[PDB]
């Protein structure tokens, strides 16, 4: 179909039936498939990134320069492939887009990088994209950047010429984002945290590859941004940055046949035009969902008040739950969030003001004030709200220094699954910054199944979609620990037995982690003053590692309940002249 008019959900691109699409959970498979695709490139590679680490290794463990992103692009450029890269130009964050740019363009003249914007603004280019020959396109939450590679093992430690290398995360790739922010990125092979005393923060994310027509659509977005960016400053207007043009006619890993629609958030400042089709697709999927929602997102800032927060995603969730309760439907909403925002902050002091600002708007959405999801649900249905929504996070544990250590798994995914039939995957967080269009630029794909699998839904036979069911089962299996308990029935995602098991695990795990590590966040610290005395106590993990180790044997999976009462007696907003909407 055409691009002369707008389409479903007011998107620039129509839905593409018969699209091969494959989802990825965690960075390990995404970066491997990116590496394989780069190797087979014949003409063009398009890349957009919020952050691009040139020296990141795409396959692990590294034994040579092969599979290192910069080396792979240099090799393809030497065969005549044109690499075009759109990088976010941060306000000197410490991501050093200048080093990424200078390093990539030093490699070969066939690699061209533009940065945007030049003008001062609060907003960023957030989309993550890699397109090969305008026929294969990767998108999702994963930047080609440090800290993103991980796998189901979610290793907390990495203790062991690279021919005999055993580290999975070399140098700057080994990090704990909450402990300390990245420094000295022009020294990629230098550690910046103590590998022997400070555990990794595991990184969880979701990506996707699409083939055919939706890859053309994503390439067309890149081309518009590329040619628009050309007009943004004199240096880029010169012929050394060629105009790009989309392929039009006659449009490989292992994907699933689905209907895929590309979606994006863009504005005048970020592109030629206004669009917020990710938001529209989010709302419509919630409105039309019939059985359950699974939401895994880095942020959860919503519930409009007309002033500070504007998007209506939370309101749609509330309306669906209120309707399910009114009609007597079995309906479940699963919300998976990172236990703490991804900023550098000593949580034992209370967290930085960035952490506190996000928590304010997160808790305003979840359970605090007249607009919160739980307050409107509680008002209508009392304690029955627990039958309809579950808010959880992830945590794991390991061993370091001869005693157990624990850290949350950072949920960076931006995925929604509905009814085991529909999936949204992209870069768009659930907040005003990602969804309004006017602010950050974002990408997403709407994936609707056309092929089905026999499954269950509240005890009844149910034809689930192949792409959506496999993703949801893979998420559920890793999160709840299905490897260790092969008796788990993950066919039915909404029946009482399974929903109870989900909540029971969340409560059981959260209690053990709190008993062993006294980890934050926690329901046991309702104010900063009780927080100050609470952290002055040495946890059992270090008091008696053997006793700690024994009790940790009862943890199943990584699922922990998201503590809704952490610091609930504090205002949490910082005082001051900064607009509050920087964080929303």
Ligand X SMILES: C[C@@H](CN1CCC2(CC1)C(=O)NCN2c1cccc(F)c1)NC(=O)c1ccc(Br)cc1
Which lies closer to ligand X via its Cβ, residue 76 or residue 433?
433
Minimum gap (Å) between residue 206 Cβ and ligand X: 14
Per CB under 6 A, the list member of 124, 142, 366, 488 interacting with ligand X is 124
Residue 412 falls in the annotated catalytic set: yes
Minimum gap (Å) between residue 355 Cβ and ligand X: 11
Q: Does 93 interact with ligand X (rule: CB under 6 A)?
A: yes
Per CB under 6 A, the list member of 151, 181, 319, 551 interacting with ligand X is 181
Which lies closer to ligand X via its Cβ, residue 98 or residue 481?
98
Minimum gap (Å) between residue 182 Cβ and ligand X: 5
Residue 181 falls in the annotated catalytic set: no
Q: Of all residues in this chain, which one has the CB nearest to ligand X in the complex?
A: 342
Residue 414 falls in the annotated catalytic set: yes
Q: Does 255 interact with ligand X (rule: CB under 6 A)?
A: no
Which lies closer to ligand X via its Cβ, residue 18 or residue 94?
94
Q: Per this entry, what is the length of the chain?
A: 584
Which lies closer to ligand X via its Cβ, residue 151 or residue 181?
181
Please tell me the count of residues contacting ligand X according to CB under 6 A: 14
Minimum gap (Å) between residue 410 Cβ and ligand X: 7
| Residues 454-483, mask of contacts with ligand X (x by CB under 6 A) | ------------------------------
Three-class SS state of 342: coil
Minimum gap (Å) between residue 321 Cβ and ligand X: 26
Three-class SS state of 56: coil
- The rounded distance, in Å, linking the Cα atoms of 202 and 174 is 10
- The rounded distance, in Å, linking the Cα atoms of 579 and 581 is 5
- The rounded distance, in Å, linking the Cα atoms of 532 and 570 is 13
Return the half-sphere exposure (C-beta side, CA atoms, 13 A cut-off) of residue 144. Answer: 35
- The rounded distance, in Å, linking the Cα atoms of 538 and 463 is 52
Which lies closer to ligand X via its Cβ, residue 140 or residue 493?
140
Residue 387 falls in the annotated catalytic set: no
Residues 322-351 that bind ligand X (CB under 6 A): 342
Which lies closer to ligand X via its Cβ, residue 373 or residue 411?
411
**Whose structure tokens read 């059985």?**
291
From 126, 172, 221, 558, the catalytic residue: 126
- The rounded distance, in Å, linking the Cα atoms of 297 and 430 is 7
Kindly give the pairing relationship between strand 16-25 and strand 206-211: antiparallel
CA 450 from chain center: how many Å? Answer: 26
Task: Please list every residue in the chain followed by a chain break, i.e. its C lies more than 2.5 Å from the next written N.
Answer: 92, 160, 251, 575
Residues 126-145 that bind ligand X (CB under 6 A): 126
Which lies closer to ligand X via its Cβ, residue 98 or residue 539?
98
| Residues paired with residue 115 on neighbouring β-strands, in sequence order | 87
**355-371 per-residue burial string, b: 16 or more CB within 10 A, e: under 16:** bbbbbbbbbbbbbbeeb
Residue 74 falls in the annotated catalytic set: no
Residues 269-298 that bind ligand X (CB under 6 A): 298
Pick the stretch among 91-99, 160-168, 469-477, 492-500 that binds ligand X (CB under 6 A): 91-99
- The rounded distance, in Å, linking the Cα atoms of 132 and 382 is 52
Q: Are the beta carbons of 450 and 17 closer than 8 angstroms? A: yes
CA 93 from chain center: how many Å? Answer: 19
Minimum gap (Å) between residue 441 Cβ and ligand X: 10
**What number of other Cβ atoms are within 10 A of residue 157's Cβ?**
16
Q: Are the beta carbons of 267 and 439 closer than 8 angstroms? A: yes
Minimum gap (Å) between residue 204 Cβ and ligand X: 12
Per CB under 6 A, the list member of 46, 57, 138, 182 interacting with ligand X is 182
From 70, 133, 267, 387, the catalytic residue: 133
Residue 419 falls in the annotated catalytic set: yes
Minimum gap (Å) between residue 200 Cβ and ligand X: 14
Q: Does 440 interact with ligand X (rule: CB under 6 A)?
A: yes
Which lies closer to ligand X via its Cβ, residue 70 or residue 127?
127
From 419, 420, 440, 449, the catalytic residue: 419
Minimum gap (Å) between residue 51 Cβ and ligand X: 6
Which lies closer to ligand X via its Cβ, residue 39 or residue 93?
93
Which lies closer to ligand X via its Cβ, residue 301 or residue 555?
301
Q: Does 12 interact with ligand X (rule: CB under 6 A)?
A: no
Distances from the Cα of 304 to the Cα of 46, 54, 370, 381, 484, angstroms? 36, 39, 11, 21, 42
**Helix or strand (DSSP H, E) at 33:** helix 27-39
Three-class SS state of 538: coil
From 116, 414, 474, 558, the catalytic residue: 414
**185-199 per-residue burial string, b: 16 or more CB within 10 A, e: under 16:** beebeebebebeebb
From 9, 76, 112, 128, the catalytic residue: 128
- Encoded tokens for 503: 């909540």
Three-class SS state of 534: helix
Pick the stretch among 70-78, 92-100, 486-494, 566-574 that binds ligand X (CB under 6 A): 92-100
**Whose structure tokens read 């590859």?**
209
Q: Does 361 interact with ligand X (rule: CB under 6 A)?
A: no
Q: Does 429 interact with ligand X (rule: CB under 6 A)?
A: yes
Q: CA gyration radius for the chain?
A: 23
By CB under 6 A, name the binding residues for ligand X.
51, 93-95, 124, 126, 177, 181-182, 298, 342, 429, 433, 440
Q: Which residues are catalytic?
A: 126, 128, 133, 412, 414, 419
């Amino acid at each position: 179909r055409d691009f002369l008019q707008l389409h479903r959900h007011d998107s620039y691109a129509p839905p593409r039936p018969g699209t091969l699409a494959r989802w990825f959970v965690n960075g390990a498979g995404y970066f491997a498939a990116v590496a394989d695709a780069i190797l087979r490139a014949q003409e063009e590679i398009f890349i957009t990134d919020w952050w691009l680490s040139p020296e990141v290794y795409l396959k692990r463990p590294a034994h040579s320069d092969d599979w290192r992103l910069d080396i792979m692009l240099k090799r393809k450029a030497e065969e005549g492939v044109r690499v075009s890269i759109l990088l976010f130009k941060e306000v000197e964050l410490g991501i050093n887009s200048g080093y990424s740019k200078r390093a990539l363009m030093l490699l070969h003249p066939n690699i061209k990088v533009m940065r945007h914007p030049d003008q001062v603004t609060l907003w960023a280019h957030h989309e993550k994209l890699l397109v090969v020959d305008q026929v294969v396109a990767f998108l999702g939450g994963l930047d080609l950047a440090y800290g993103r590679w991980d796998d189901l093992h979610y290793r907390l430690t990495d203790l062991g010429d690279l021919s005999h290398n055993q580290f999975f995360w070399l140098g700057k790739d080994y990090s704990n984002l909450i402990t300390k922010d990245w420094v000295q990125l022009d020294r990629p092979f230098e550690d910046f945290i103590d590998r022997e005393t400070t555990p990794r923060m595991p990184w969880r994310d979701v990506g996707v590859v699409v083939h055919g027509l939706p890859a053309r659509d994503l390439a067309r977005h890149f081309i518009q941004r590329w040619n628009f960016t050309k007009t943004t400053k004199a240096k880029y207007k010169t012929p050394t940055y060629p105009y790009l043009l989309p392929k039009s006619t006659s449009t490989l890993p292992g994907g699933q046949c689905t209907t895929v629609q590309v979606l994006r958030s863009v504005d005048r400042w970020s592109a030629g035009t206004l669009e917020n089709s990710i938001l529209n697709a989010y709302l419509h999927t919630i409105r039309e969902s019939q059985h359950f929602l699974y939401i895994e997102n880095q942020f959860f800032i919503s519930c409009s008040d007309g002033r500070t927060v504007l998007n209506k995603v939370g309101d749609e969730i509330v309306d669906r739950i209120l309707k399910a309760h009114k009609q007597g439907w079995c309906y479940r909403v699963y919300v998976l969030l990172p236990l703490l925002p991804g900023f550098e902050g000593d949580i034992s002091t209370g967290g930085g003001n960035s952490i506190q600002a996000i928590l304010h708007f997160t808790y305003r959405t979840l359970c605090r004030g007249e607009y919160s999801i739980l307050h409107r649900l509680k008002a209508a249905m009392g304690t029955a709200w627990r039958d309809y929504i579950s808010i959880c996070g992830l945590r794991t544990h390991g061993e370091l220094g001869g005693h157990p250590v624990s850290e949350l798994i950072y949920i960076h995914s931006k995925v929604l699954i509905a009814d085991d039939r529909t999936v949204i995957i992209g870069s768009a967080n659930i907040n005003d910054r990602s969804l309004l269009g006017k602010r950050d630029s974002e990408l997403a794909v709407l994936i609707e199944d056309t092929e089905t699998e026999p499954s269950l839904m509240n005890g009844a036979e149910y034809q689930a979609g192949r792409f959506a069911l496999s993703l949801r089962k893979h998420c559920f299996g890793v999160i709840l620990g299905a490897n260790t308990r092969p008796d788990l029935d993950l066919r039915d995602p909404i029946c009482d037995d399974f929903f109870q098991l989900w909540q029971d695990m969340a409560e059981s795990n959260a209690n053990i982690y709190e008993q062993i590590f006294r980890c934050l966040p926690s329901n046991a610290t309702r104010s900063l003053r009780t927080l100050r005395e609470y952290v002055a106590v040495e946890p059992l993990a270090t008091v008696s590692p053997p006793l700690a180790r024994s009790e940790l044997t009862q943890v199943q999976g990584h699922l922990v309940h998201f503590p809704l009462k952490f610091l609930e007696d504090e205002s949490l907003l910082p005082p001051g002249m900064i607009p509050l909407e920087v964080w929303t």
